[PDB]
Amino acid sequence: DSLFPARCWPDPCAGITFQNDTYVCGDPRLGPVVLPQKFPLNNELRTYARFGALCPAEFLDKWATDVAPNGTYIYPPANGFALDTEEQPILGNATLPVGMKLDRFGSEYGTFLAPLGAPYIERSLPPSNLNTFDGMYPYNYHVYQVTKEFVVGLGPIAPWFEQPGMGTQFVTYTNVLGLIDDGYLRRLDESEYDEKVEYSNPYTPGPNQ
Amino acid sequence: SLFPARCWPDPCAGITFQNDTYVCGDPRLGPVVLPQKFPLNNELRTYARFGALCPAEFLDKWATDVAPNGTYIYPPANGFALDTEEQPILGNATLPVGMKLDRFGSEYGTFLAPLGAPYIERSLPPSNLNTFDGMYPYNYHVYQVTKEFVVGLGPIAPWFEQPGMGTQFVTYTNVLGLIDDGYLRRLDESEYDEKVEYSNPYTPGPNQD
Ligand SMILES: NC(=O)c1cccc([C@@H]2O[C@H](COP(=O)(O)OP(=O)(O)OC[C@H]3O[C@@H](n4cnc5c(N)ncnc54)[C@H](O)[C@@H]3O)[C@@H](O)[C@H]2O)c1
Ligand SMILES: *[C@@H]1O[C@H](CO[C@@H]2O[C@@H](C)[C@@H](O)[C@@H](O)[C@@H]2O)[C@@H](O[C@@H]2O[C@H](CO)[C@@H](O)[C@H](O)[C@H]2NC(C)=O)[C@H](O)[C@H]1NC(C)=O
Ligand SMILES: *[C@@H]1O[C@H](CO[C@@H]2O[C@@H](C)[C@@H](O)[C@@H](O)[C@@H]2O)[C@@H](O[C@@H]2O[C@H](CO)[C@@H](O)[C@H](O)[C@H]2NC(C)=O)[C@H](O)[C@H]1NC(C)=O
Ligand SMILES: *[C@@H]1O[C@H](CO[C@@H]2O[C@@H](C)[C@@H](O)[C@@H](O)[C@@H]2O)[C@@H](O[C@@H]2O[C@H](CO)[C@@H](O)[C@H](O)[C@H]2NC(C)=O)[C@H](O)[C@H]1NC(C)=O
Ligand SMILES: *[C@@H]1O[C@H](CO[C@@H]2O[C@@H](C)[C@@H](O)[C@@H](O)[C@@H]2O)[C@@H](O[C@@H]2O[C@H](CO)[C@@H](O)[C@H](O)[C@H]2NC(C)=O)[C@H](O)[C@H]1NC(C)=O
Ligand SMILES: *[C@@H]1O[C@H](CO[C@@H]2O[C@@H](C)[C@@H](O)[C@@H](O)[C@@H]2O)[C@@H](O)[C@H](O)[C@H]1NC(C)=O
Ligand SMILES: *[C@@H]1O[C@H](CO)[C@@H](O)[C@H](O)[C@H]1NC(C)=O
Ligand SMILES: [Ca+2]
Ligand SMILES: [Ca+2]
Ligand code: NA
């Protein structure tokens, strides 16, 4: 393991402007120095090489507008859905059933979720989505459960940010907070997603029903 | 917990013993011994193999019979998730050279997932963890694309008491054929035992010209 690929030593942070010691190389775009060590977060991050095989400045050079602190991450086209052979996004409008569990790295003003437990690398997220903004939600990780059916854009996640992607994303037409407001999602606390059976599916009916 | 606590005292009630080393002596219920090492143990960390059901309940719901002659019933539309009009969500997509895929199953089949996808994201029955070739414990195979080729690519519908919602790659030619024609190569476990080997070096960064 370790924070950087072995090639990056002895100066892995060369080219990075230090800003704040909470983050890798002092740069919030490179995510937090400290990573989760409890289930399920550690399970979702077990396959996560933060910069792939790149070093920090190469990673920022590739995926952001500038290695300097003013550089912003560039996001994939077509809302990050994987593209078919004709460059069109693969997705469909789909009804999320009551009982389905969803999770998300990001504030509740966002519109992108994944099925509960998807690996971080399946989400094609940059390292900064693991930064903590509310101490009640370390690593900006939120878990929800569908309390009333609603329709979302549903489809595969394109590779991005030096990761393979290919999770499924749910792109909502109301942001998360709005969906909670209107009774479509409820928040789950950690006791509701800390055992294996709580990842299983009781709501989908069988073929013989 | 192998069985949900609700199934005690006698979880194997209704199951006919057939073969030892399988849960309740029934190969449809998968092996007793589950994988002990990364990445397989990472892929099964969220797997409750019957959900909240007891073995006979699970077979009654998902197979044609609890008796040994029962066979698992599979989801329609080749297991793709369905949109609000009951059409499968998928597109034809080019898999790029370098992409890593994996699969629980034999090389005569056609369904793969992105390397590292959780077992519950694949909506597979317990018997896809059965070992048929000691060279491949749990029938777990990993591949890398060596020449680009087109697959059906889409979200995985929930089935078998699991949420699904990984992405599946549905090949037009079985795995063995694709290896033989030079589209896939087999990976040794040494080639997927480190986090960096799950990252993506082949997808290019956005154009900034
Ligand atoms: N296996 C995974 O890891 C996986 C990844 C992503 C998604 C999925 C999910 O798998 C589900 C399908 O399961 P199934 O066992 O049918 O897959 P697979 O093993 O690839 O087989 C495909 C078809 O090819 C035929 N055939 C396969 N072997 C032989 C053989 N030795 N001899 C003769 N014919 C054979 C047969 O029609 C079979 O149904 C589907 O619902 C899908 O959602 C799994
Ligand atoms: C690094 O900066 C943070 C402040 O960052 C802001 O607040 C975060 C919650 C998040 O919104 C970031 O994106 C923001 O840029 C410092 O956090 C403060 O730390 C002081 C410690 O003296 C503490 O008193 C305050 O409570 C913190 N402020 C907030 C708003 O939480 C942090 O200390 C900085 N790191 C270092 C090493 O100084
Ligand atoms: C599971 O076992 C069966 C054999 O039947 C079981 O074992 C007996 C010793 C006895 O205890 C029975 O009551 C059990 O039900 C295997 O089926 C045999 O397979 C071989 C090789 O393929 C074949 O030559 C025999 O004809 C088969 N016998 C029958 C009755 O079909 C079966 O292969 C085992 N399955 C697994 C996954 O191990
Ligand atoms: C598939 O098998 C079931 C169950 O078979 C019985 O139980 C097994 C464990 C073993 O002991 C078999 O030899 C048994 O016949 C069949 O279910 C029927 O179960 C009823 C229950 O009242 C019993 O009366 C019958 O005799 C069985 N039916 C027959 C013999 O026609 C089931 O029929 C089998 N599969 C199909 C497609 O019918
Ligand atoms: C995806 O493309 C297939 C056809 O792709 C060709 O055939 C495959 C077997 C494989 O060799 C590919 O590399 C080829 O490019 C479409 O299948 C056709 O669909 C139409 C209408 O749905 C049907 O009438 C044709 O007979 C199908 N062809 C075959 C050979 O079955 C498929 O529709 C495409 N899927 C999407 C979502 O665009
Ligand atoms: C972004 O900022 C660049 C200059 O940043 C400064 O120089 C670099 C080398 C670092 O030392 C950094 O800490 C400094 O703040 C500009 O050259 C560039 O044009 C700016 N980008 C935009 C889009 O304006
Ligand atoms: C999904 O629904 C939204 C809102 O109703 C609509 O704007 C969009 O075109 C639909 N997309 C598909 C693929 O049906
Ligand atoms: Ca719990
Ligand atoms: Ca290795
Ligand atoms: Na070096």
Nearest CA distance, B2 vs chain A (angstrom): 10
Query: Which string of DSSP letters, residue by residue, matches chain A?
Result: --SS-GGGTT-TTTTPPP--TTBGGG-GGG-BSS---STTHHHHTTT--TTTTS-HHHHHHHHBS-SSTT--BPPPSGGGBPB-TTS-B--EEEEEPTT-EEEEES-TT--EEEETT--GGGGT--GGGG--SSTTSGGGEEEEEESS-EEEEEEEBPPBTTB---BEEEE-SS-HHHHHHTTSEEE--GGGSSSGGGGS-SSSPPTT-
Interface test with B, best of A91, A120, A204 (most B CBs within 10 A): A204
Q: How many CB atoms lie within 10 A of CB B207?
A: 6
Residue tagged 């602190």 (tokens): A69
Q: How many CB atoms lie within 10 A of CB B15?
A: 22
| Residue ranges of domains in chain A | 6-199
DSSP code of B72? B
**3-class DSSP assignment, residue B73:** coil
Which chain B residue is nearest to residue A88, measuring alpha carbons?
A: B91
Determine the longest span between alpha carbons in chain A, in angstroms: 62
Are B22 and B12 in contact by the 8 Å Cβ rule? The answer is no
Burial class (CB in 10 A: 0-12, 13-18, 19+), B10: exposed
Indicate which technique resolved this structure: X-ray
A153: nearest Cα among A172, A174, A178, A125: A172
Count how many pairs of residues, chain A against chain B, have C-beta atoms within 8 Å: 197
Nearest CA distance, A86 vs chain B (angstrom): 9
Check if B103 is active-site: yes
Residue tagged 């194997």 (tokens): B12
Q: How many CB atoms lie within 10 A of CB B197?
A: 18
Check if B87 is active-site: no
A137: nearest Cα among A189, A175, A194: A189
Catalytic annotation, pick one of B28, B49, B162, B168: B168
Length of chain A equals 209
Instruction: Measure the CA–CA gap between B184 and B141, rounded to whole angstroms.
Output: 12
Instruction: Measure the CA–CA gap between B196 and A107, rounded to whole angstroms.
Output: 28
H or E stretch including B149?
Answer: strand B149-155
CA atoms within 13 A on the CB side of B38: 12
For this experimental structure, what is the resolution in angstroms?
1.9
Cβ of A200 within 8 Å of Cβ of B161? The answer is yes
Q: Which amino acid is at B185?
A: R
DSSP code of B155? E
DSSP code of B190? G
Quote the radius of gyration of chain B (alpha carbons, Å).
Answer: 18
Instruction: Measure the CA–CA gap between A102 and B118, rounded to whole angstroms.
Output: 15
Bridge-based pairing of strands A141-146 and B140-145 is unpaired
Cβ of B83 within 8 Å of Cβ of A100? The answer is no
Are A167 and B164 in contact by the 8 Å Cβ rule? The answer is no
Cβ of B114 within 8 Å of Cβ of A49? The answer is no
Bridge-based pairing of strands A112-115 and A185-187 is unpaired
B194 is in an annotated binding site: yes
Q: Which residues contact A197 (CB under 8 A, 6 or more apart)?
A: B1, B4, B48, B51, B52
Instruction: State the binding site of A for Ca(2+).
Output: 191, 194-195, 198
- Annotate A64-83 with b (16+ C-beta within 10 A) or e (fewer): beebeeeeebbebeebbbbb
Joined tokens for residue B67: 């008796």
With a 6 Å cutoff on the Cβ, whether B19 touches ligand 3 is yes
B99: nearest Cα among B149, B140, B139: B149
Instruction: Measure the CA–CA gap between A56 and A49, rounded to whole angstroms.
Output: 12
Q: Which residues contact A44 (CB under 8 A, 6 or more apart)?
A: A117, A118, A119, A120
